[PDB]
C-alpha cells in the first residue's frame, strides 16, 4: 500500500546528510508508484516527485518519471564559487534485453539559474560562448537557461552479488544531448566499469578493476556548461585526494593580472582508473566477508579542459593537458554496520600536481540502506 523512510549519513566530502521519502505503492489502481523524496548535504539540496511503473507494458518495459528541484552551492563542494538553482522533469522508458543488459531512453527538461559566480577564466569562456558578458570584477550576476535533452543509457550488470561482489562485471554508459530549441547546445557521455576477478575458490581474495570516463563538448560554438563538468578526487574516484581537487584550477579575474589559484573547477574530459586487491580482514572471521571487506588499492585519474585557450594565457598552466595523471595508494575498509554501510580509507597521494589538495583519511556512512 505504501511506506516512508528517513536517513542520516556522513561523508568527508558531504558532511552530515539527511534523506526522507514517502511512497504510495499503487495509485488508485493504476499500477504507478507515486512518491516524494528529499536529500540534503553540505553543498546540495534535492527534492523530487517520483512516478514509476516496473510494468508499463506487461512485457516489463518500465516507465520512470521525475519533477525535481535542486540547489547546488559550489564552494561547499570545494569548487570555485557559484550557486545553481534548477528544476525540471524527466520521462524515461526502461527496456530489459536479457538478464544482464538493459537500455533506457528519455526526454528531459531542466531550468538552470546561475548566480554568485566568482569571475574566473574558464567559467567566463563558457559564458562568452553563450552570448553572456557579465562583469569580471563582480560576483553579483545571473544567467538563466531552459534546456530540453534526449537521454539514453546502457547498463550491463553480471555481478554475482549487489553488495560486496566477488565475480563479474558492471558497465554503465549514459548519454545526453540537447534538442534544438534549448539555450545550451552540448552532449555529455559517461562510462563506468567494474570487474571482479576471484583468484581463490572460496572467493575471499578478489581483484577489482574500476574505470570511469567522461567526455562532453559544446556544439556550434557553445561550450558545455561548467555545472555539467566532470570532477575527480575523493572517496569514490581517486582516494587520498580532496573531493574534486583533480584537474583544472580557477584562474580568477581581479575584483574592483589574473590570479592563479588552487580552487578546482572540474573539466569536460575525465578518466579515472583503480586497481584494488580485495582480501580477508585482519582480526575478523571470513564468515563476515559478506558484511566486512578489506582492500588495498592503486587509484589514478585526471580531469582536463579541452577548450583551455593556452594561446591567451601562456603564463598559466595549460589545463587542456590530459597527461597529468594523479595517483595514490592506500587501504580501504567497508562494513555493513548497525549505523549503515560504512567505508573508511587511508591513502597517500604519491603523484600530485601544482594546486592539488590531499585528504588522506576519508569516511562515509550511507543513509539509503
Amino acid at each position: 500500500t505504501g511506506s516512508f523512510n528517513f536517513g542520516i549519513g556522513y561523508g568527508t566530502e558531504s558532511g552530515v546528510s539527511f534523506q526522507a521519502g514517502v511512497q504510495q505503492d499503487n495509485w488508485l489502481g493504476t499500477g504507478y508508484a507515486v512518491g516524494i523524496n528529499g536529500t540534503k548535504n553540505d553543498y546540495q539540496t534535492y527534492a523530487e516527485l517520483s512516478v514509476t511503473n516496473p510494468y508499463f507494458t506487461v512485457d516489463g518495459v518500465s516507465l520512470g518519471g521525475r519533477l525535481f528541484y535542486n540547489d547546488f552551492q559550489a564552494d561547499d563542494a570545494d569548487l570555485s564559487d557559484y550557486t545553481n538553482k534548477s528544476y525540471g522533469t524527466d520521462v524515461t522508458l526502461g527496456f530489459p534485453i536479457n538478464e544482464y543488459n538493459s537500455l533506457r531512453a528519455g526526454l528531459g527538461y531542466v531550468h538552470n539559474s546561475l548566480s554568485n559566480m566568482q569571475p574566473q577564466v574558464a567559467m567566463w569562456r563558457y559564458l562568452y560562448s553563450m552570448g553572456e558578458h557579465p562583469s569580471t570584477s563582480d560576483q553579483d550576476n545571473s544567467f538563466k537557461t531552459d534546456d530540453f535533452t534526449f537521454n539514453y543509457g546502457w547498463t550491463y550488470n553480471k555481478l554475482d552479488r549487489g553488495y560486496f561482489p566477488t565475480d563479474g562485471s558492471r558497465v554503465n554508459l549514459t548519454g545526453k544531448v540537447t534538442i534544438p530549441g534549448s539555450d545550451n547546445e552540448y552532449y555529455k557521455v559517461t562510462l563506468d566499469t567494474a570487474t571482479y576477478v576471484p583468484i581463490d575458490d572460496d572467493h575471499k581474495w578478489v581483484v577489482l578493476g574500476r574505470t570511469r570516463w567522461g567526455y562532453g563538448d559544446g556544439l556550434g560554438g557553445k561550450e558545455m556548461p561548467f555545472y555539467e563538468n566532470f570532477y575527480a578526487g575523493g572517496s569514490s574516484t581517486v582516494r587520498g585526494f580532496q573531493s574534486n581537487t583533480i584537474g583544472p584550477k580557477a584562474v580568477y579575474f581581479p575584483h574592483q593580472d589574473l590570479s592563479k589559484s588552487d580552487d578546482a573547477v572540474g573539466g569536460n574530459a575525465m578518466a579515472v582508473a583503480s586497481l584494488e586487491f580485495i582480501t580477508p580482514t585482519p582480526f575478523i572471521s571470513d564468515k563476515y566477508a559478506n558484511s566486512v571487506r578489506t582492500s588495498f588499492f592503486w587509484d589514478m585519474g585526471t580531469v582536463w579542459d579541452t577548450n583551455w585557450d593556452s594561446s591567451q594565457y601562456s603564463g598559466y598552466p595549460d589545463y587542456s593537458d590530459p597527461s597529468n595523471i594523479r595517483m595514490s595508494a592506500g587501504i580501504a575498509l567497508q562494513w555493513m554496520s548497525p549505523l549503515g554501510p560504512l567505508v573508511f580509507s587511508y591513502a597517500q597521494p604519491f603523484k600530485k600536481y601544482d594546486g592539488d589538495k590531499a585528504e588522506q583519511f576519508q569516511f562515509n556512512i550511507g543513509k539509503t540502506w
Binding site: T1, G2, S3, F4, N5, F6, I8, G340
Partner: peptide
Amino acid sequence: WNWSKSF
C-alpha cells in the same frame, strides 16, 4: 542509517 516504516 536508514529507518523504513511501511504504513
